[PDB]
Design a protein around this nucleic acid. Structure first.
Ligand SMILES: [Mg+2]
Ligand SMILES: [Mg+2]
Ligand SMILES: [Mg+2]
Ligand SMILES: [Mg+2]
Ligand SMILES: [Mg+2]
Ligand SMILES: [Mg+2]
Ligand SMILES: [Mg+2]
Ligand SMILES: [Mg+2]
Ligand SMILES: [Mg+2]
Ligand SMILES: [Mg+2]
Ligand SMILES: [Mg+2]
Ligand SMILES: [Mg+2]
Ligand SMILES: [Mg+2]
Ligand SMILES: [Mg+2]
Ligand SMILES: [Zn+2]
Lengths: 199, 129, 129, 191, 137, 259, 52
RNA sequence: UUCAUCUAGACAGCCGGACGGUGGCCAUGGAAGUCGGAAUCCGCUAAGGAGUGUGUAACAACUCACCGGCCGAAUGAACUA
């Protein structure tokens, strides 16, 4: 309600906070609604994940410092699309599961580019008829075994430039991306200790 | 004639069976032309390897005049019709109601043949005794 | 080219300009006589959907003879038999009144009592005494 | 509703010096000077600390206060152009007849000259307004860039060009040919 | 590179050669193996064939719609069933489906897909989901 | 009206030079050949006169307007040939359109040609009889031509290979492949490459534009810009017979006679 | 033709607009009234028809 | 005039997500949220309609509600004259 639902959230927050002394703040951006559900119940023993709006989670552990003021050495890392993984399982197991999901970001939407994106040679396997997509950019196609084959490796997108959906739909609707996207680890907690990404 | 007119008279119209070849890239335009002209699909099958969908459809030879023209304008010239008579179809639309698109037919058929506008009702041909 | 169901001479072309050149060729070389072009007429049929909501009284010019009847539609199954030649008018009945009763929901008592077909004596319109 | 006092604050940076008497405002920075007459607006200016200037309206109706934020944006655009400049890029768009664009000079003209628009035999001439500099981007096919300090004078100059290729008598969602602004930005790009 | 292509539905034996011509497969063999896979089984179910460049493996991928109609008997609505035992058996066959953290949350979804069908002997679903609370295999 | 309506036939008698029949990769007598030709109609309304001509022929010369590309009726007359199991060869026609109307550039032009051929082979592979199969057409195979009928000119890459056996020494076989695709020459580096290779900045033009195209563009712009003294000297290094009163015209139709 | 980018570009100025249902004025795509005095700055607006 | 949202971060703009039972049931030549009726449940959730549009022949593909990141102070709706 006015503050009753926002206070249901405060309730589940101190719940997790006191039970677990180890913690994971995780960068959740360009992530997927499915990508989350993947192993959201991975290690039902001690590994859990929860998140909300930061501006309201700052006011929670702000008022959780008259009683147990030892999590004040946590606020500087609540500043973006970041969430939380409460765990007490060995802290090295969790880092190597969370980063290892990586939906692989297929592919673009006329967005911006990393660097020189190149299309290689060798036979694509696409049925001839998708040839229009390959002509659109200018790659010399040639139908070899009933399947489109590129010759003359050419750079499709230049260094970090605005890609066009004609170029995108070639990479996207047909090929590999190679843009890739997973969760990230901004910091760790273990009994009042703020560990960075080290182990 | 009197008994006839008491039996919910209708009329039957000739209905073609239309087969059109066209590539997937343009078969949308086939469907949009059949709709204006009371078409009625029965089949749709891509030929394997080719794009080349074939569409089998039910065109009243009534509406077919101008059709293949309207057809290949809607497919950018890519659609190839081929027709044949299939069956007689009955119109629930009332024949003696000139408003309904069966009375329009009979009303037009009446004028060019050179007789009276709308048909004598069932009252005639009948004798009360 | 062929004669229309409704008696028109028909030229069936492939397109509007294929038809253009077929036709002008027809008037100058092949026929060599001035010609008139029309949209073909569509043949229809007249039929009853229902069973003649009241028996048909109809008296004669002298006030002496009166005829009563009701009318109903023949199942398309049947009309496709008469047209395709199962139910002949030149076939003798019983033999023909057998196949009607067993296969069409029909009643052999009626099928023997057929008198004639219609029109032209071989058409799909029956009369039962 | 007669807002009793509203003001906007103009953030003036290092290299520039601005000067306001009556309401004529001269503003000069790294790349030259600019000027606006505003004795059509009825505001007052207050130099607070040599890197800020207040524009103020006293007792003003809705329409009056509307002008206030516009003066902030106007002068702000002078300081911006006098430091960073503005660069408008345009791409020519054509489906069949390639558009030929050059610069030509009759009596020191510097006119943008447009030939073959949709195959026209007419040749369109857009003069280049003073202080804009027209260089045709190399390595980008069919891109012209206009640049200079006065965003007014470059943008109006780009409008002129975009509008001399208004396509008459046809269905302009089919006949998309023309010379259309593609990127509005600064000269020394930076930010 | 074993092919993986999920096909349409059907019940007995029964036009998809446009996707299997490049697969060099018989538009006579494929439907002859699928009628074997479509056994219950005379209802409508989602099928998935994995291809080995010669012959096809007709598997029946267990659908929530397909299962519940087998447990049931104008509109072919067979909406007369119960067997909250049978409903529970479906959800186990869902086999890591819905992401359900419990064997009940997965029986809360097979029981909710009762769009047209009786959940208990004389009850409806979506009301029989409560502290009714049984079956945690 | 300027549209073929009935497809009509004509049998052409023509010779071939002694070295040309040597390349014919099928058993082949003599030096004179007999070309039984049919001029077909494009209009769909006359497609019945194409199937009527494709039943009586063995190969098909398919013409593609260079600027219009391969079009809808190109597509369906091809499905008429490959159904009847007929071998194609292609003339990319009407190029003088590309130099005038489009002001095209040599690379602008080459890449026009590439995607056009790509487009035809797509049609060729989809419908060509898997029985015969291999029948795709490629320019370095010598199965593609380039020109404009209305200026009465055309060329293939093979014809350009042979002329270069004479002047710059080398054999033709390593010219065909070099003259198409990405093979370059690097002047004063006197050496070919086998990719774009950029020469560490400033990439060079493919052999196609350099040895084939650049001859025609040089011609065109001199004539059309009325370059009255460049043209007389283009006489020499190409060995062209200017005649008499034919030298006595302006540009314009001057180009159509020189080409 | 027009590379789909520059077609999308010209479409911004030519197509992606709206029309005053009273006085036909060509208006910004997400406008809410007509700017024209002649139609009382009516709010009755509609998209400019996108061809094909 | 009446009713709402907001420093427990609103309005706007920008930006990330917009799922899983599931192509949900009756149909349909085909209709996979998106011709149409009937249903409007569940799961997993920070939230994501058995769907706000665009789209397809049908999917795809974009889009929106919905959630969140950003910013940091007020703001939104429907009426009256
Ligand atoms: Mg009509
Ligand atoms: Mg008509
Ligand atoms: Mg017009
Ligand atoms: Mg003409
Ligand atoms: Mg033309
Ligand atoms: Mg407040
Ligand atoms: Mg918001
Ligand atoms: Mg907001
Ligand atoms: Mg639907
Ligand atoms: Mg839909
Ligand atoms: Mg329910
Ligand atoms: Mg759903
Ligand atoms: Mg979708
Ligand atoms: Mg909102
Ligand atoms: Zn208006």
């Amino acid at each position: 309600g006015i503050r009753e639902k926002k206070a249901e959230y405060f309730a589940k927050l101190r719940e997790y906070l006191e039970e677990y002394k180890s913690l994971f703040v995780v960068g959740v951006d360009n992530v997927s609604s499915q990508q989350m559900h993947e192993v959201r119940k991975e290690l039902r023993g001690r590994a859990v994940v929860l998140m909300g709006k930061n501006t309201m989670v700052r006011r929670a552990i702000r008022g959780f410092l008259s009683d147990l003021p030892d999590f004040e050495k946590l606020l500087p890392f609540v500043k973006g699309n970041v969430g939380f993984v409460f765990t007490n399982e060995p802290l090295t197991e969790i880092k190597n599961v969370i980063v290892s999901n990586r939906v692989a970001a297929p592919a673009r939407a006329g967005a911006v580019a990393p660097e020189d994106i190149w299309v290689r040679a060798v036979n694509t396997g696409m049925e001839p008829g998708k040839t229009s997509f390959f002509q659109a950019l200018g790659v010399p196609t040639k139908i070899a075994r009933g399947t489109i084959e590129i010759v003359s490796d050419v750079k499709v997108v230049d260094a970090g430039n605005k890609v066009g959906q004609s170029e995108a739909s070639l990479l996207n609707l047909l090929n590999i991306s190679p843009f890739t996207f997973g969760l990230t680890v901004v910091q760790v907690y273990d009994n009042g200790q703020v560990f960075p990404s080290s182990i | 004639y009197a008994g006839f007119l008491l039996a919910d008279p209708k009329i039957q119209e000739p209905v073609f069976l239309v087969e059109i070849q066209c590539p997937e890239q343009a078969v949308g335009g086939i469907y949009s032309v059949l709709n204006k002209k009371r078409g009625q699909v029965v089949s749709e099958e891509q030929r394997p390897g080719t794009p080349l969908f074939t569409v089998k459809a039910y065109l009243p030879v009534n509406e077919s005049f101008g059709f293949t023209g309207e057809l290949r304008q809607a497919t950018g010239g890519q659609a190839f019709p081929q027709m044949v008579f299939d069956h007689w179809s009955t119109l629930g639309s009332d024949p003696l109601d000139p408003t309904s698109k069966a009375g329009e037919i009979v009303l037009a058929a009446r004028k060019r043949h050179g007789m009276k506008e709308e048909v004598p009702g069932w009252q005639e041909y009948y004798d009360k005794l | 080219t062929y004669m229309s169901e409704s008696g028109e001479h028909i030229v069936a072309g492939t397109g509007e300009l294929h038809l253009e050149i077929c036709l002008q060729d027809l008037e100058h070389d092949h026929a060599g006589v001035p010609l008139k072009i029309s949209p073909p007429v569509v043949a229809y049929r007249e039929t009853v959907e229902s069973e003649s909501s009241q028996t048909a009284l109809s008296k004669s010019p002298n006030k002496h003879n009166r005829i009563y009847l009701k009318a109903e539609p023949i199942d398309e199954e049947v009309s496709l038999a008469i047209e395709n030649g199962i139910i002949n008018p030149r076939d003798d009945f019983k033999a023909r009144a057998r196949i009607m009763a067993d296969d069409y929901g029909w009643d052999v008592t009626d099928a023997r009592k057929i008198w004639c077909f219609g029109p032209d004596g071989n058409g799909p319109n029956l009369v039962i005494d | 509703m007669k807002y009793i006092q509203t003001e906007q604050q103009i953030e003036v940076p290092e290299g520039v010096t601005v000067s306001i008497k009556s309401r004529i405002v001269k503003v000069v920075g790294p790349r030259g000077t600019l000027t606006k007459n505003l004795k059509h607006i009825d505001v007052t200016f207050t130099k607070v600390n040599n890197q800020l200037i207040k524009v103020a309206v006293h007792n003003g109706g809705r329409k009056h206060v509307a002008a206030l934020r516009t003066v902030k944006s106007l002068v702000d655009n002078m300081i911006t152009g006098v430091t960073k400049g503005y660069k408008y890029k345009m791409r020519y768009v054509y489906a069949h007849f390639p558009i030929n664009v050059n610069i030509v000079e009759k009596d020191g003209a510097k006119f943008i000259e447009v030939r073959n628009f949709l195959g026209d035999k007419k040749i369109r001439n857009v003069p280049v307004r003073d202080g804009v500099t027209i260089e045709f981007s190399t390595n980008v096919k069919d891109e012209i860039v206009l640049s200079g300090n006065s965003v007014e004078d470059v943008s109006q100059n780009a409008a002129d060009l975009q509008q001399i290729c208004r396509v008459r008598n046809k269905d302009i969602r089919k006949f998309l040919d023309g010379i259309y602004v593609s990127h509005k930005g600064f000269i020394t790009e930076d930010l | 590179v074993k092919y993986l292509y999920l096909r349409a539905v059907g019940g007995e034996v029964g036009l998809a050669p446009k996707i299997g011509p490049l697969g060099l497969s018989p538009k006579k063999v494929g439907e002859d193996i699928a009628k074997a896979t479509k056994e219950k089984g005379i209802k409508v179910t989602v099928q998935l064939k994995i291809q080995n460049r010669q012959a096809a493996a007709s598997v029946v991928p267990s659908a929530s719609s397909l299962v519940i109609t087998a447990l049931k008997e104008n509109v072919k609505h067979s909406g007369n069933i119960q067997l909250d035992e049978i409903i529970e058996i479906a959800r186990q066959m869902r086999d890591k489906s819905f992401g359900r953290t419990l064997a009940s949350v997965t029986k809360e979804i097979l029981g909710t897909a009762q769009s047209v069908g009786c959940r208990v002997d004389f009850k409806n679903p979506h009301d029989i989901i409560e502290g009714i609370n049984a079956g945690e295999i | 009206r300027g549209i073929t309506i009935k497809s009509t036939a004509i049998s052409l008698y023509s010779e071939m030079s002694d070295e040309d029949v040597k390349e014919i990769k099928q058993k082949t007598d003599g030096n004179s050949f007999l070309i039984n030709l049919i001029d077909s109609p494009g209009h769909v309304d006359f497609s019945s006169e194409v199937t009527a001509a494709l039943r009586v022929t063995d190969g098909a010369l398919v013409v593609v307007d260079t600027i219009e590309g391969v079009c809808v009726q190109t597509e369906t007359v091809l499905r008429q040939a490959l159904g009847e199991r007929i071998k194609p060869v292609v003339v990319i026609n009407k190029v003088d359109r590309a130099l005038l109307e489009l002001q095209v550039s040599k690379e602008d032009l080459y890449q026009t040609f590439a995607r056009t051929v790509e487009s035809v082979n797509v049609i060729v592979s989809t419908y060509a009889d898997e029985v015969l199969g291999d029948v795709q057409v490629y320019p370095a195979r010598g199965t593609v031509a380039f020109g404009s009928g209305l200026h009465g000119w055309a060329f293939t890459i093979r014809q350009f290979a042979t002329r270069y056996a004479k002047k710059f020494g080398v054999d033709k076989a390593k010219m065909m492949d070099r003259l198409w695709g990405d093979s370059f020459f690097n002047p004063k580096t006197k050496k070919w490459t086998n990719k774009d290779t950029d020469a560490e900045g400033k990439p060079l033009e493919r052999a196609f534009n350099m040895f084939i195209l650049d001859p025609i563009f040089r011609l065109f712009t001199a004539i059309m810009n009325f370059k009255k003294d460049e043209i007389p000297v283009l006489l020499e290094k190409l060995e062209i017979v200017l005649k008499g009163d034919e030298k006595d015209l302006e540009g314009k139709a001057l180009l159509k006679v020189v080409m | 033709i027009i590379e789909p980018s520059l077609k999308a570009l010209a479409s911004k100025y030519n197509c992606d607009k709206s029309v005053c249902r009273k006085c036909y004025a060509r208006l910004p795509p997400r406008a809410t009234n007509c700017r024209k005095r002649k139609c009382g700055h009516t709010n009755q607006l509609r998209p400019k028809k996108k061809l094909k």
